[PDB]
């Protein structure tokens, strides 16, 4: 119904719990399928199958095993964000295939069950890597614009507050008259340098997933 | 025998028996395990 | 080459001239090739092409009008001269690889270019497409941080103002009482079209550029 591509406009971005590298795999689990666009802004892959080729691939893939395919959407739902949906998670971000190992273990014996998440589809890498990140991207940069408004008003409160009489008395840990220009050129030079980490996904999660999330609707 | 794992009934065991020669035998086998039931748990009271 | 690539990675974004797509390109004309990644908001490219490349680019829509291979890329080089940095813009977003049709004149007969990016793998958009845009990102969400805690201790400062003296002065900048997150939510009503549906990306490069000059450091 192709919900697994508008489930990856709004995909929320879900860090991944490795023993390994831990990606940014982050899917719309649905009754029919999924797409997990494994995004950790450092390579993108992309999970378009259907819950018949995926609970086939666990039927096969577990060597001795007799469940409906039910039982695999389910334990895929766990998944629904991509936190635990068993075990541990594992990526091979070596090619265009993420293999997400799912090890279903209970203790009995050997298992060994994965994801393969084929070649992303640049559509939804822009849905997730341009076209919403762009559009955050730009929102947070007027957001300081209209916060350079913000701090230049307060600045000149302050200041003609201090002119006009009842100023503060401690003027050892006041502030002198402050600009938005005099916050941004020692950002440029400071924080903008290492504020540029990309990471493995955790620094879009930690401050960027939540605005991406305000501006998935388009 | 079934072990209800993973939200599923999974088959815990599928075990092939076949029928036996005279059910008298393992009857004596059930009611000699009946004489270590009876001195199983409650009964050594006395004793301590 | 690398060397065009690093100049993309320093010189700034700069949306193509169309008026059709949002077409945010990054503008780094050097000799030897040059460097326009340009993105379409539903597909993600990598234009680190080469002189070569660029003057068989520039022939493979071209029919009669023709040019030697530098003459080609300094043709190209004086074709952004006037608008981006000839001044007629256009592409194909279907296409797979960004064409962008570029029908500048130069004979009063027809001359096609196109500025035709590589399509980015998953291992090449963090080259440009996350390393500079999501840095600048992060960074404008440090500085979103960073500003709003500055507003509200400014605020506290404001406020002890008015407690030791009751004086107004101006009430045209006089501030509200600041929160970071009425402010994202205030912007996510109106700029949110700018954001989600992008559509120059103007505001967005006359506005983080200064941010791109210096988020190179990955």
Redesign the interface.
């Given at each position: 119904m192709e919900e697994l591509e508008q489930g990856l406009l709004m995909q929320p971005w879900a860090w991944l719990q490795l023993a390994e590298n831990s990606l940014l795999a982050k899917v719309f689990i649905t009754k029919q399928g999924y797409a997990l666009l494994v995004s950790d802004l450092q390579q993108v892959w992309h999970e378009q199958v259907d819950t018949s080729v995926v609970s086939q691939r666990a039927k096969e893939l577990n060597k001795r095993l007799?469940?409906?395919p039910a039982?695999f959407l389910?334990?895929l739902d766990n998944l629904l964000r991509p936190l635990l949906k068993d075990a541990t998670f594992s990526c091979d971000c070596v090619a265009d295939a993420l293999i997400l190992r799912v090890r279903?273990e209970?203790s009995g014996l050997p298992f060994y069950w994965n994801f393969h998440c084929m070649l992303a589809s640049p559509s939804l890498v822009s849905q997730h890597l341009i076209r919403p990140l762009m559009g955050m991207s730009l929102a947070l940069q007027c957001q300081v614009r209209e916060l350079a408004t913000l701090l230049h008003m307060k600045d000149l409160e302050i200041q003609d507050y201090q002119e006009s009489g009842a100023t503060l008395i401690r003027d050892r840990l006041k502030t002198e008259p402050f600009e938005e220009n005099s916050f941004l050129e020692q950002f440029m030079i400071e924080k903008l340098p290492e504020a540029c980490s990309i990471g493995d996904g955790k620094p879009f999660v930690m401050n960027l997933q939540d605005l991406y999330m305000a501006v998935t609707t388009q | 025998f079934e072990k209800n794992?993973?939200?599923?009934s999974?088959?815990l065991g599928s075990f092939n028996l076949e029928k036996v020669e005279n059910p008298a035998e393992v009857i004596r086998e059930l009611i000699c395990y009946c004489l270590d039931t009876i001195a199983e748990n409650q009964a050594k009271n006395e004793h301590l």
């Open positions: 007799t469940a409906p039982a389910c334990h279903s209970l | 794992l993973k939200d599923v999974f088959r």
